[model samples]
Target: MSDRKAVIKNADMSEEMQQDAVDCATQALEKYNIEKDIAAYIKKEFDKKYNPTWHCIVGRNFGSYVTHETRHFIYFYLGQVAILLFKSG
Candidate 1:
């Protein structure tokens, strides 16, 4: 796909590997329902090496109403904020 082509062109890899890389990246955009640019940004960050054995990183979507765990954290944060506001007032 042209979208994959544009993203992979500048990457320093062989032709065969490039296609595989594109295949690896294909799911991220559709899976998250995020924009291509945002997906690419996450891809770029994930590509950076952190250790010798670890080669890749997984990205998580972090917006509102995505999961119950996230919702609980949001509510907890808001509750803390309300208590702080009440004390300050």
Candidate 2:
């Protein structure tokens, strides 16, 4: 069990889908200590579960401007790390 929680900064998606992003982030954090590795795990999971072409970014502090399919984007923080996940065309 993790005490860390996802504080959503912005998202245009279903509640469940956003929650899934949070879960994926948490799981990734548990498995890997590196930002890029965590990112790849989350993206690959989303791509297989929902569809292809998922992208993810993980960091302590960063800015992102991205494109995503309608209702398929999420941005949140899990503890100190930030995550921006989306599915693009």
Candidate 3:
């Protein structure tokens, strides 16, 4: 877990919110090893805790384009997997 530092590539969220995303991903990665499951878990958590219609993509060596609410988007890597999370407005 310690080795899986949340290396942010881009973001529109506040520091606290961004940290929360990392925390959720850390916990999700610990709970589930599959990339799709991790993505679903993070998306579910975001919908419950922050906003509705949250989207998440988890994988290695991928590209994505998304539209989200203002200040509610993040792209980062955790270990070998990249996590793209955002809230659709």
Candidate 4:
């Protein structure tokens, strides 16, 4: 939903999404008592995609935190944690 383009202003949406990623990363840090580097690591999962500042790298911009190393082990771990916390309940 956040990925949709309205015009050249899509950069604005990317900015919002980057903020969201920062928020989500912060949330994960506080929730797990992890270090800020965790988010940096997560951000590194996609170099060309993740911009410390909100900006487009190539053609399309990512509106989500989908990452590469983020798919290794943390994916399942976070999935399990999510299910444990917020399931169909």
Candidate 5:
């Protein structure tokens, strides 16, 4: 996960927003107990999809968007988890 730590280095976001993203990421990880690689992929994909369009406003809108993105990624990955469980079952 150390290498993946650099994934958010180039983000052009405010500190507060970045912190929020980090917190959301942590929550997602705890909620799923997913592999590190998937978590890394989520962070990278999240940044790619959201960072470009994010306006960095200091209000509920930006926070809502962040939460929505995080939830979207988690739900998508949860589908993968279901498929894996079904195959192994």
Candidate 6:
């Protein structure tokens, strides 16, 4: 029931490329779960990027999650700290 968007890549391209993008996006979404990559991309494209906003958000949630002793941690991968920062930004 959720309306999501996707652009099918050229069929000639290897499925691995498409899947890699999907996998990266999925992991990024799951780990951060706050700042969305799509939103970051949008902001970047529009040159309306806010630094540290998303990071603060993620840090707050990370502290709460840690304080509550809940599951999971807010960590980034291979230069994905931007996404975490995006959450707080």
- The per-residue C-alpha lDDT of model 1 at residue 44 equals 47
Let me know the TM-score candidate 5 reaches against the reference structure: 0.30
Model 1, 1-89: lDDT tens per residue? 44322232123345563444444344444344444443343334334442112122223222333332210111111111110000000
Tens digit of lDDT per residue, candidate 5, span 1-89?
Answer: 44432123223455575455545554545455554444554455355666432221111112233433322211112222310000000
Angstrom error at residue 85, model 1: 43
State, as a TM-score between 0 and 1, how close model 2 is to the true structure: 0.73
Candidate numbers, best TM-score first, in rank order: 3, 2, 5, 1, 6, 4
Per model, how many backbone clashes are there? 0, 0, 0, 0, 0, 12
RMSD of 5: 15.0
Off by over 4 Å in 1: 1-6, 34-89
Q: What is the C-alpha lDDT of each candidate?
A: 0.28, 0.71, 0.73, 0.31, 0.34, 0.34
Cα lDDT tens digits for candidate 3, 1-89: 46545577877667788777778887787678886888788888788866787877665543545323344777778656888887766
Cα RMSDs of all predictions? 17.6, 3.8, 3.5, 15.9, 15.0, 14.3
Q: Report the C-alpha lDDT of model 4 over 1-89, residue by residue, as the tens digit.
A: 67532123222234465445434544555564443344343444333364332221221233344332122111112211220110010
Q: Which window of 10 residues has the lowest lDDT sum in candidate 6?
A: 70-79
lDDT by residue (1-89, candidate 6, tens digit) is: 88443333222234573344334544545554455554354333223443322221223222243343322112322223332222321
Question: Candidate 3, which ten residues in sequence have the lowest lDDT sum?
Answer: 62-71
* Comparison by TM-score, 4 against 6, better one: 6
TM-score for each model? 0.28, 0.73, 0.74, 0.26, 0.30, 0.27
Clashing pairs in 4: none
Q: In candidate 3, which residue pairs clash?
A: none
